mmCIF file of C-alpha atoms in Angstrom:
data_model
loop_
_atom_site.group_PDB
_atom_site.id
_atom_site.type_symbol
_atom_site.label_atom_id
_atom_site.label_comp_id
_atom_site.label_asym_id
_atom_site.label_seq_id
_atom_site.Cartn_x
_atom_site.Cartn_y
_atom_site.Cartn_z
ATOM 1 C CA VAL A 14 135.168 -46.931 -62.860
ATOM 2 C CA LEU A 15 133.958 -47.169 -66.110
ATOM 3 C CA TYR A 16 135.036 -45.323 -69.911
ATOM 4 C CA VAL A 17 132.204 -44.978 -72.298
ATOM 5 C CA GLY A 18 133.845 -43.294 -75.435
ATOM 6 C CA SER A 19 137.183 -42.586 -74.939
ATOM 7 C CA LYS A 20 141.191 -43.686 -75.326
ATOM 8 C CA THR A 21 143.366 -45.144 -72.134
ATOM 9 C CA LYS A 22 147.295 -45.371 -72.521
ATOM 10 C CA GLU A 23 148.424 -45.703 -69.137
ATOM 11 C CA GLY A 24 151.830 -47.439 -68.811
ATOM 12 C CA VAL A 25 153.184 -46.705 -72.429
ATOM 13 C CA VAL A 26 156.535 -46.216 -73.925
ATOM 14 C CA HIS A 27 156.449 -45.929 -78.060
ATOM 15 C CA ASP A 28 158.688 -44.261 -80.690
ATOM 16 C CA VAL A 29 161.491 -44.391 -78.905
ATOM 17 C CA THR A 30 164.701 -43.875 -81.620
ATOM 18 C CA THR A 31 168.552 -44.468 -81.827
ATOM 19 C CA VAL A 32 170.242 -43.801 -84.805
ATOM 20 C CA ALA A 33 174.537 -44.025 -85.363
ATOM 21 C CA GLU A 34 177.173 -43.530 -87.356
ATOM 22 C CA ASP A 35 180.661 -44.340 -87.551
ATOM 23 C CA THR A 36 180.729 -44.500 -83.703
ATOM 24 C CA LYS A 37 183.138 -46.775 -81.362
ATOM 25 C CA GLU A 38 183.443 -49.050 -78.183
ATOM 26 C CA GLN A 39 185.810 -50.102 -76.272
ATOM 27 C CA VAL A 40 185.377 -51.623 -72.629
ATOM 28 C CA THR A 41 189.657 -52.771 -72.074
ATOM 29 C CA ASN A 42 189.719 -54.072 -68.408
ATOM 30 C CA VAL A 43 186.792 -54.641 -66.964
ATOM 31 C CA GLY A 44 185.315 -56.765 -63.924
ATOM 32 C CA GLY A 45 181.869 -56.844 -64.957
ATOM 33 C CA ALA A 46 180.025 -54.940 -67.451
ATOM 34 C CA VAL A 47 176.667 -54.016 -68.423
ATOM 35 C CA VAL A 48 177.042 -52.236 -71.985
ATOM 36 C CA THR A 49 173.427 -52.041 -73.075
ATOM 37 C CA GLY A 50 171.504 -49.751 -76.238
ATOM 38 C CA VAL A 51 167.294 -48.957 -75.193
ATOM 39 C CA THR A 52 166.051 -50.505 -72.812
ATOM 40 C CA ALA A 53 161.763 -49.702 -72.720
ATOM 41 C CA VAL A 54 159.795 -51.048 -69.851
ATOM 42 C CA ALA A 55 156.244 -50.428 -70.020
ATOM 43 C CA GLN A 56 154.158 -51.994 -66.910
ATOM 44 C CA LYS A 57 151.268 -50.912 -66.143
ATOM 45 C CA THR A 58 151.177 -52.357 -61.997
ATOM 46 C CA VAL A 59 154.317 -53.009 -60.016
ATOM 47 C CA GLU A 60 155.527 -53.930 -57.275
ATOM 48 C CA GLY A 61 159.491 -54.295 -58.108
ATOM 49 C CA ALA A 62 161.663 -52.330 -60.182
ATOM 50 C CA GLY A 63 161.416 -51.563 -63.777
ATOM 51 C CA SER A 64 164.833 -52.032 -65.417
ATOM 52 C CA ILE A 65 168.096 -52.958 -62.728
ATOM 53 C CA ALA A 66 171.910 -52.902 -64.129
ATOM 54 C CA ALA A 67 174.211 -54.427 -61.910
ATOM 55 C CA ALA A 68 177.366 -54.871 -62.096
ATOM 56 C CA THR A 69 180.740 -56.121 -59.843
ATOM 57 C CA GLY A 70 183.644 -56.041 -60.643
ATOM 58 C CA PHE A 71 187.846 -56.701 -59.531
ATOM 59 C CA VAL A 72 190.491 -55.189 -60.549
ATOM 60 C CA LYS A 73 193.593 -56.300 -58.651
ATOM 61 C CA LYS A 74 196.518 -55.752 -61.908
ATOM 62 C CA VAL B 24 135.284 -42.211 -61.532
ATOM 63 C CA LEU B 25 133.995 -42.197 -65.275
ATOM 64 C CA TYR B 26 135.405 -40.667 -68.725
ATOM 65 C CA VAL B 27 132.639 -40.130 -71.145
ATOM 66 C CA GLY B 28 134.624 -38.649 -74.033
ATOM 67 C CA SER B 29 138.159 -38.288 -73.036
ATOM 68 C CA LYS B 30 141.805 -39.247 -73.937
ATOM 69 C CA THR B 31 143.702 -39.743 -70.762
ATOM 70 C CA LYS B 32 147.442 -40.631 -71.011
ATOM 71 C CA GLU B 33 149.091 -41.471 -67.785
ATOM 72 C CA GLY B 34 152.237 -42.674 -67.252
ATOM 73 C CA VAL B 35 152.865 -42.428 -70.694
ATOM 74 C CA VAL B 36 157.280 -41.804 -72.055
ATOM 75 C CA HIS B 37 157.803 -41.689 -76.432
ATOM 76 C CA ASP B 38 159.239 -40.013 -79.126
ATOM 77 C CA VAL B 39 162.456 -40.070 -77.051
ATOM 78 C CA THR B 40 165.463 -39.868 -79.561
ATOM 79 C CA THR B 41 168.940 -40.430 -79.344
ATOM 80 C CA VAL B 42 171.719 -39.455 -82.976
ATOM 81 C CA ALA B 43 175.213 -39.877 -82.694
ATOM 82 C CA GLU B 44 177.559 -39.843 -85.245
ATOM 83 C CA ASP B 45 181.969 -40.665 -84.945
ATOM 84 C CA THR B 46 182.224 -40.742 -81.065
ATOM 85 C CA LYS B 47 184.351 -42.873 -78.817
ATOM 86 C CA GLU B 48 183.965 -44.368 -75.738
ATOM 87 C CA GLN B 49 186.612 -45.802 -73.458
ATOM 88 C CA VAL B 50 186.384 -47.084 -69.834
ATOM 89 C CA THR B 51 189.512 -49.232 -69.177
ATOM 90 C CA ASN B 52 190.268 -50.002 -65.458
ATOM 91 C CA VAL B 53 186.995 -50.461 -64.119
ATOM 92 C CA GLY B 54 185.997 -53.146 -61.664
ATOM 93 C CA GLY B 55 182.096 -53.024 -62.005
ATOM 94 C CA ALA B 56 180.780 -50.563 -65.084
ATOM 95 C CA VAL B 57 177.171 -49.711 -66.428
ATOM 96 C CA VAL B 58 177.423 -47.889 -69.479
ATOM 97 C CA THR B 59 173.750 -47.522 -71.172
ATOM 98 C CA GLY B 60 172.080 -45.748 -73.794
ATOM 99 C CA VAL B 61 168.412 -44.730 -74.069
ATOM 100 C CA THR B 62 166.798 -45.362 -71.055
ATOM 101 C CA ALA B 63 162.421 -45.790 -70.750
ATOM 102 C CA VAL B 64 159.975 -46.680 -67.949
ATOM 103 C CA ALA B 65 157.010 -46.239 -68.354
ATOM 104 C CA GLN B 66 154.772 -47.368 -65.367
ATOM 105 C CA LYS B 67 151.228 -45.904 -63.864
ATOM 106 C CA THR B 68 151.339 -47.926 -60.119
ATOM 107 C CA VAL B 69 154.597 -48.737 -58.441
ATOM 108 C CA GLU B 70 155.244 -49.801 -55.515
ATOM 109 C CA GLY B 71 159.116 -49.908 -56.213
ATOM 110 C CA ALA B 72 161.541 -48.308 -58.546
ATOM 111 C CA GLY B 73 161.169 -46.934 -61.785
ATOM 112 C CA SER B 74 165.074 -47.518 -62.758
ATOM 113 C CA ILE B 75 167.939 -48.991 -61.091
ATOM 114 C CA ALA B 76 172.002 -48.983 -62.226
ATOM 115 C CA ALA B 77 173.992 -49.946 -59.925
ATOM 116 C CA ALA B 78 177.907 -50.708 -60.088
ATOM 117 C CA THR B 79 180.863 -52.066 -56.650
ATOM 118 C CA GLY B 80 184.107 -52.153 -57.654
ATOM 119 C CA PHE B 81 187.515 -52.888 -56.861
ATOM 120 C CA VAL B 82 190.668 -51.405 -58.514
ATOM 121 C CA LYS B 83 193.576 -52.218 -56.313
ATOM 122 C CA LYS B 84 196.746 -52.454 -59.268
ATOM 123 C CA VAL C 9 134.757 -51.880 -64.137
ATOM 124 C CA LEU C 10 133.310 -51.862 -67.850
ATOM 125 C CA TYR C 11 134.117 -50.566 -71.043
ATOM 126 C CA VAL C 12 131.259 -49.396 -73.712
ATOM 127 C CA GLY C 13 133.116 -47.865 -76.714
ATOM 128 C CA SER C 14 137.413 -47.198 -75.590
ATOM 129 C CA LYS C 15 140.648 -48.331 -77.042
ATOM 130 C CA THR C 16 142.952 -49.258 -73.749
ATOM 131 C CA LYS C 17 146.467 -50.071 -74.295
ATOM 132 C CA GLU C 18 148.274 -50.273 -70.742
ATOM 133 C CA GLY C 19 151.549 -51.586 -70.631
ATOM 134 C CA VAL C 20 152.480 -51.298 -74.068
ATOM 135 C CA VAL C 21 155.822 -50.538 -75.828
ATOM 136 C CA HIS C 22 155.679 -50.003 -80.051
ATOM 137 C CA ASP C 23 157.944 -48.478 -82.679
ATOM 138 C CA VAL C 24 161.367 -48.720 -80.986
ATOM 139 C CA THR C 25 163.733 -48.392 -83.527
ATOM 140 C CA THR C 26 167.846 -49.139 -83.848
ATOM 141 C CA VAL C 27 170.077 -47.932 -86.704
ATOM 142 C CA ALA C 28 173.412 -48.174 -86.909
ATOM 143 C CA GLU C 29 175.945 -47.873 -90.103
ATOM 144 C CA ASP C 30 180.272 -48.728 -89.751
ATOM 145 C CA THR C 31 180.278 -49.239 -85.974
ATOM 146 C CA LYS C 32 183.069 -50.543 -83.390
ATOM 147 C CA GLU C 33 182.805 -52.661 -80.293
ATOM 148 C CA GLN C 34 185.759 -54.080 -78.500
ATOM 149 C CA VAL C 35 185.425 -55.702 -75.336
ATOM 150 C CA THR C 36 189.094 -56.792 -74.402
ATOM 151 C CA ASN C 37 189.102 -58.240 -71.132
ATOM 152 C CA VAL C 38 186.650 -58.543 -69.196
ATOM 153 C CA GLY C 39 185.564 -60.883 -66.614
ATOM 154 C CA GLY C 40 182.316 -61.354 -67.553
ATOM 155 C CA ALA C 41 179.627 -58.518 -69.142
ATOM 156 C CA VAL C 42 176.264 -58.663 -71.059
ATOM 157 C CA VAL C 43 176.293 -56.532 -74.248
ATOM 158 C CA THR C 44 172.903 -55.724 -75.487
ATOM 159 C CA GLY C 45 170.763 -54.233 -78.195
ATOM 160 C CA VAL C 46 167.136 -53.599 -78.175
ATOM 161 C CA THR C 47 165.433 -54.553 -74.601
ATOM 162 C CA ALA C 48 161.673 -54.267 -74.696
ATOM 163 C CA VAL C 49 159.668 -55.844 -71.638
ATOM 164 C CA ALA C 50 155.722 -55.208 -72.157
ATOM 165 C CA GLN C 51 153.809 -56.246 -68.838
ATOM 166 C CA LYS C 52 150.692 -55.145 -67.284
ATOM 167 C CA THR C 53 150.909 -56.602 -63.798
ATOM 168 C CA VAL C 54 153.994 -57.737 -62.338
ATOM 169 C CA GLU C 55 155.494 -59.176 -58.756
ATOM 170 C CA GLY C 56 159.183 -59.043 -59.684
ATOM 171 C CA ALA C 57 161.546 -56.805 -62.297
ATOM 172 C CA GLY C 58 160.983 -56.378 -65.623
ATOM 173 C CA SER C 59 164.906 -56.463 -66.700
ATOM 174 C CA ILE C 60 167.650 -57.163 -64.706
ATOM 175 C CA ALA C 61 171.051 -57.713 -66.188
ATOM 176 C CA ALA C 62 174.084 -58.635 -63.850
ATOM 177 C CA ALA C 63 177.572 -59.191 -64.774
ATOM 178 C CA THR C 64 180.277 -60.073 -62.044
ATOM 179 C CA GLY C 65 183.609 -60.522 -62.293
ATOM 180 C CA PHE C 66 187.207 -61.169 -61.767
ATOM 181 C CA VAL C 67 189.913 -59.689 -63.576
ATOM 182 C CA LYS C 68 193.516 -60.259 -61.470
ATOM 183 C CA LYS C 69 196.183 -60.053 -64.430
ATOM 184 C CA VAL D 19 186.790 -34.835 -108.327
ATOM 185 C CA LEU D 20 187.762 -37.396 -106.329
ATOM 186 C CA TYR D 21 186.605 -38.546 -103.488
ATOM 187 C CA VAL D 22 189.237 -40.624 -100.746
ATOM 188 C CA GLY D 23 187.338 -41.527 -98.011
ATOM 189 C CA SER D 24 183.817 -39.086 -97.316
ATOM 190 C CA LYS D 25 180.260 -39.273 -96.820
ATOM 191 C CA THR D 26 177.932 -37.384 -99.195
ATOM 192 C CA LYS D 27 174.892 -36.537 -99.254
ATOM 193 C CA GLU D 28 173.626 -34.119 -101.689
ATOM 194 C CA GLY D 29 170.226 -33.612 -102.430
ATOM 195 C CA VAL D 30 168.432 -35.139 -99.732
ATOM 196 C CA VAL D 31 165.745 -34.820 -96.987
ATOM 197 C CA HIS D 32 164.843 -37.171 -94.513
ATOM 198 C CA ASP D 33 163.516 -37.556 -91.223
ATOM 199 C CA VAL D 34 160.341 -36.134 -91.853
ATOM 200 C CA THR D 35 157.017 -36.611 -90.045
ATOM 201 C CA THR D 36 153.664 -35.413 -89.711
ATOM 202 C CA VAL D 37 151.441 -36.467 -86.923
ATOM 203 C CA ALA D 38 147.298 -34.981 -86.470
ATOM 204 C CA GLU D 39 145.235 -36.826 -84.011
ATOM 205 C CA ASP D 40 140.838 -35.097 -84.230
ATOM 206 C CA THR D 41 141.484 -32.727 -86.879
ATOM 207 C CA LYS D 42 139.232 -31.399 -89.749
ATOM 208 C CA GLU D 43 139.220 -30.819 -93.155
ATOM 209 C CA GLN D 44 136.095 -29.233 -94.936
ATOM 210 C CA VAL D 45 136.342 -27.887 -98.580
ATOM 211 C CA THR D 46 132.783 -26.569 -99.932
ATOM 212 C CA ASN D 47 132.787 -25.137 -102.999
ATOM 213 C CA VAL D 48 135.754 -25.064 -104.637
ATOM 214 C CA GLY D 49 136.435 -25.838 -108.218
ATOM 215 C CA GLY D 50 139.676 -26.950 -108.473
ATOM 216 C CA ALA D 51 141.577 -28.003 -105.370
ATOM 217 C CA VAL D 52 144.648 -29.525 -104.516
ATOM 218 C CA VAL D 53 145.029 -30.482 -100.512
ATOM 219 C CA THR D 54 148.264 -32.661 -99.737
ATOM 220 C CA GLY D 55 150.252 -33.892 -96.697
ATOM 221 C CA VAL D 56 154.031 -33.960 -97.351
ATOM 222 C CA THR D 57 155.547 -33.318 -99.982
ATOM 223 C CA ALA D 58 159.065 -34.676 -100.411
ATOM 224 C CA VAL D 59 160.892 -33.775 -103.757
ATOM 225 C CA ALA D 60 165.475 -35.072 -103.645
ATOM 226 C CA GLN D 61 166.738 -34.411 -106.651
ATOM 227 C CA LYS D 62 171.024 -33.537 -106.970
ATOM 228 C CA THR D 63 170.533 -32.452 -111.144
ATOM 229 C CA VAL D 64 167.436 -30.412 -112.172
ATOM 230 C CA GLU D 65 166.087 -28.715 -114.840
ATOM 231 C CA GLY D 66 163.072 -28.076 -113.822
ATOM 232 C CA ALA D 67 161.027 -27.593 -111.099
ATOM 233 C CA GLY D 68 160.558 -29.518 -108.120
ATOM 234 C CA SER D 69 157.073 -29.732 -106.991
ATOM 235 C CA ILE D 70 154.299 -27.696 -109.336
ATOM 236 C CA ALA D 71 151.083 -27.140 -107.627
ATOM 237 C CA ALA D 72 148.372 -25.633 -109.442
ATOM 238 C CA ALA D 73 144.823 -25.151 -109.654
ATOM 239 C CA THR D 74 142.258 -23.003 -111.739
ATOM 240 C CA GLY D 75 139.323 -22.009 -110.732
ATOM 241 C CA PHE D 76 135.584 -21.694 -111.313
ATOM 242 C CA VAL D 77 132.817 -20.427 -108.226
ATOM 243 C CA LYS D 78 129.842 -18.670 -110.131
ATOM 244 C CA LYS D 79 126.960 -19.753 -108.079
ATOM 245 C CA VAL E 27 185.424 -38.880 -111.193
ATOM 246 C CA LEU E 28 186.655 -41.412 -108.967
ATOM 247 C CA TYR E 29 185.583 -42.502 -105.397
ATOM 248 C CA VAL E 30 188.169 -45.097 -103.704
ATOM 249 C CA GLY E 31 186.318 -45.128 -100.373
ATOM 250 C CA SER E 32 183.001 -43.272 -100.228
ATOM 251 C CA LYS E 33 178.982 -43.617 -99.179
ATOM 252 C CA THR E 34 177.152 -41.326 -101.906
ATOM 253 C CA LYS E 35 173.921 -40.373 -101.114
ATOM 254 C CA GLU E 36 172.398 -38.207 -104.040
ATOM 255 C CA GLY E 37 169.193 -37.789 -104.711
ATOM 256 C CA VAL E 38 167.525 -39.763 -101.339
ATOM 257 C CA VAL E 39 164.550 -39.490 -99.079
ATOM 258 C CA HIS E 40 164.305 -41.556 -96.794
ATOM 259 C CA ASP E 41 162.219 -42.162 -93.093
ATOM 260 C CA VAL E 42 158.914 -39.807 -94.285
ATOM 261 C CA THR E 43 156.038 -41.065 -91.319
ATOM 262 C CA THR E 44 152.742 -39.481 -91.649
ATOM 263 C CA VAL E 45 150.346 -40.840 -88.208
ATOM 264 C CA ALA E 46 147.110 -40.267 -88.123
ATOM 265 C CA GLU E 47 144.092 -40.688 -85.886
ATOM 266 C CA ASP E 48 140.730 -39.718 -85.209
ATOM 267 C CA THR E 49 140.461 -37.660 -88.272
ATOM 268 C CA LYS E 50 137.738 -36.531 -90.755
ATOM 269 C CA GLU E 51 138.159 -35.456 -93.959
ATOM 270 C CA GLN E 52 135.200 -33.553 -96.009
ATOM 271 C CA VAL E 53 135.299 -32.411 -99.990
ATOM 272 C CA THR E 54 132.015 -31.558 -100.883
ATOM 273 C CA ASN E 55 131.176 -29.597 -104.343
ATOM 274 C CA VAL E 56 134.898 -29.349 -105.672
ATOM 275 C CA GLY E 57 134.850 -29.693 -109.900
ATOM 276 C CA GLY E 58 138.101 -31.404 -109.433
ATOM 277 C CA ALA E 59 139.918 -32.491 -106.776
ATOM 278 C CA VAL E 60 143.308 -34.007 -105.832
ATOM 279 C CA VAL E 61 143.526 -34.814 -101.804
ATOM 280 C CA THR E 62 147.048 -37.024 -101.531
ATOM 281 C CA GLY E 63 148.967 -38.114 -98.428
ATOM 282 C CA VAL E 64 152.555 -38.464 -98.784
ATOM 283 C CA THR E 65 154.436 -37.860 -101.801
ATOM 284 C CA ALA E 66 158.180 -39.150 -102.008
ATOM 285 C CA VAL E 67 159.705 -37.982 -105.370
ATOM 286 C CA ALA E 68 163.930 -39.826 -105.334
ATOM 287 C CA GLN E 69 165.302 -38.623 -108.772
ATOM 288 C CA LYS E 70 169.290 -37.857 -109.493
ATOM 289 C CA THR E 71 169.277 -36.249 -112.652
ATOM 290 C CA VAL E 72 166.102 -34.807 -114.139
ATOM 291 C CA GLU E 73 165.011 -32.454 -117.487
ATOM 292 C CA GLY E 74 160.852 -31.516 -115.662
ATOM 293 C CA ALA E 75 159.426 -32.332 -112.381
ATOM 294 C CA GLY E 76 159.446 -33.832 -109.985
ATOM 295 C CA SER E 77 155.619 -33.629 -108.528
ATOM 296 C CA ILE E 78 153.059 -32.320 -110.216
ATOM 297 C CA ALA E 79 149.334 -31.884 -108.920
ATOM 298 C CA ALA E 80 146.928 -30.259 -111.488
ATOM 299 C CA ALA E 81 142.834 -29.722 -110.581
ATOM 300 C CA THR E 82 141.385 -27.214 -112.771
ATOM 301 C CA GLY E 83 137.318 -26.887 -112.258
ATOM 302 C CA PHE E 84 133.837 -25.587 -112.769
ATOM 303 C CA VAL E 85 131.261 -25.158 -110.375
ATOM 304 C CA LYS E 86 128.436 -22.972 -111.428
ATOM 305 C CA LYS E 87 125.036 -24.320 -109.108
ATOM 306 C CA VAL F 6 183.754 -42.687 -113.663
ATOM 307 C CA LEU F 7 184.748 -45.210 -111.410
ATOM 308 C CA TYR F 8 184.478 -47.110 -107.460
ATOM 309 C CA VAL F 9 186.946 -49.005 -105.678
ATOM 310 C CA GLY F 10 184.883 -49.623 -102.398
ATOM 311 C CA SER F 11 181.722 -47.636 -102.377
ATOM 312 C CA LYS F 12 178.050 -47.752 -101.407
ATOM 313 C CA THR F 13 176.820 -44.984 -103.740
ATOM 314 C CA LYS F 14 172.718 -44.788 -103.500
ATOM 315 C CA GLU F 15 171.294 -42.077 -106.064
ATOM 316 C CA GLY F 16 167.747 -42.252 -106.604
ATOM 317 C CA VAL F 17 166.282 -43.507 -103.775
ATOM 318 C CA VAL F 18 162.829 -43.252 -101.597
ATOM 319 C CA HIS F 19 162.537 -45.958 -98.860
ATOM 320 C CA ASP F 20 161.375 -46.230 -95.386
ATOM 321 C CA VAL F 21 158.583 -44.238 -95.698
ATOM 322 C CA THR F 22 155.771 -45.187 -93.412
ATOM 323 C CA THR F 23 151.690 -44.259 -92.824
ATOM 324 C CA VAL F 24 149.288 -45.075 -89.742
ATOM 325 C CA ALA F 25 146.208 -44.370 -89.770
ATOM 326 C CA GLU F 26 143.201 -45.335 -87.241
ATOM 327 C CA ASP F 27 140.495 -44.471 -86.559
ATOM 328 C CA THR F 28 139.889 -41.741 -89.529
ATOM 329 C CA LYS F 29 136.811 -40.850 -92.165
ATOM 330 C CA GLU F 30 137.012 -39.613 -96.159
ATOM 331 C CA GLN F 31 133.936 -38.235 -97.677
ATOM 332 C CA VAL F 32 133.733 -36.692 -101.238
ATOM 333 C CA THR F 33 130.637 -36.337 -101.502
ATOM 334 C CA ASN F 34 129.791 -34.121 -105.267
ATOM 335 C CA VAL F 35 133.246 -34.071 -107.302
ATOM 336 C CA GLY F 36 133.484 -34.162 -111.142
ATOM 337 C CA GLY F 37 135.767 -35.552 -110.828
ATOM 338 C CA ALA F 38 138.520 -36.475 -107.990
ATOM 339 C CA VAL F 39 141.952 -38.559 -107.501
ATOM 340 C CA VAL F 40 142.451 -39.238 -103.849
ATOM 341 C CA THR F 41 146.089 -41.042 -103.033
ATOM 342 C CA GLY F 42 147.612 -42.298 -100.130
ATOM 343 C CA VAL F 43 151.851 -42.851 -100.462
ATOM 344 C CA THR F 44 153.071 -42.138 -104.178
ATOM 345 C CA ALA F 45 156.954 -43.245 -104.162
ATOM 346 C CA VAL F 46 158.659 -42.544 -106.889
ATOM 347 C CA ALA F 47 162.590 -43.042 -107.513
ATOM 348 C CA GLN F 48 163.644 -42.950 -110.562
ATOM 349 C CA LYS F 49 167.764 -42.006 -111.794
ATOM 350 C CA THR F 50 167.875 -40.397 -115.063
ATOM 351 C CA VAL F 51 164.453 -38.969 -116.111
ATOM 352 C CA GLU F 52 163.361 -36.567 -119.297
ATOM 353 C CA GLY F 53 159.601 -36.330 -118.554
ATOM 354 C CA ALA F 54 157.967 -35.667 -114.735
ATOM 355 C CA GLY F 55 157.824 -37.975 -111.991
ATOM 356 C CA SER F 56 154.224 -38.358 -110.263
ATOM 357 C CA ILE F 57 151.275 -36.626 -112.289
ATOM 358 C CA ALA F 58 148.137 -36.034 -110.266
ATOM 359 C CA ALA F 59 145.526 -34.219 -112.795
ATOM 360 C CA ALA F 60 141.425 -33.856 -111.985
ATOM 361 C CA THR F 61 139.104 -31.933 -114.059
ATOM 362 C CA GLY F 62 135.827 -31.656 -113.419
ATOM 363 C CA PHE F 63 132.724 -30.027 -113.701
ATOM 364 C CA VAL F 64 129.995 -30.036 -110.759
ATOM 365 C CA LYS F 65 126.271 -28.081 -112.355
ATOM 366 C CA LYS F 66 124.055 -28.659 -109.925
#
């Protein structure tokens, strides 16, 4: 492999924008919760995963 | 493989935009929950997955 | 491998913007919670994962 | 006039984006020239104009 | 006029973005020239203009 | 006029961004020239103009 004159963008995330005004979030009775916003994962060579969101709960009342 | 003059964008996510005004979110009785927004995963070479959202719950009342 | 004249951006996340005005967040009765904002993970070579959000809870009442 | 609870955006320009890669501009024999990019003009109360581009030339050869 | 609880954005320009890579500009034989980039003009109350680009030239050869 | 509780942004320009990589500019034979980048002009009350770019030239050869 060789690159003489070149621009290579491999495994890239850019220009991700989030805008929010007058919003409302309520999680009332949750055993375990994962609430997130932007999640950016850039990776050229991987063996596992990129983003893992796990939630295991128990709401007995 | 060789690139003499070239632009290669392989495995890329860009320009992802989220706009939200006067919204409302409620999760009332959830065992385990995963609530997210933007999830961007760029990866050239992978062996596993890219984004894993897992939720295992129990709402007995 | 060789690069004579080249720009290589591999495994990159940039220009991620979050804007929020007059918002409201409430987590009332949660066993374990993970609330986040921007999560940026750039990594060229990985063996594990990139972002792991785990929440295990118990809401008995 | 009165505003009790309100959001008023009057006379506004926002989120104007220009992206350009590998472009080419040539103005060879021009008497007078006006070459521009983004031109944003926000103004609530005006008596004149907003943007005036004037070019008066003479190419005799 | 009165504002009890309010957000007023009148005469505003924001979030104007210009991105340029590997570009080329040439003005070869111009009497008078005006080459510009971003031009942002925000003004609530005006009597004149907002942006005036004037170019008067003479290319005799 | 009165503001009891309020945020007023009148006559404002903000968040103007310019990004440029590997670019090229040439003005070869120009009588008078005006080459600029970002031009931001915020003004609440004006009688004249906001931005005046004037170029008057003479290329006889």
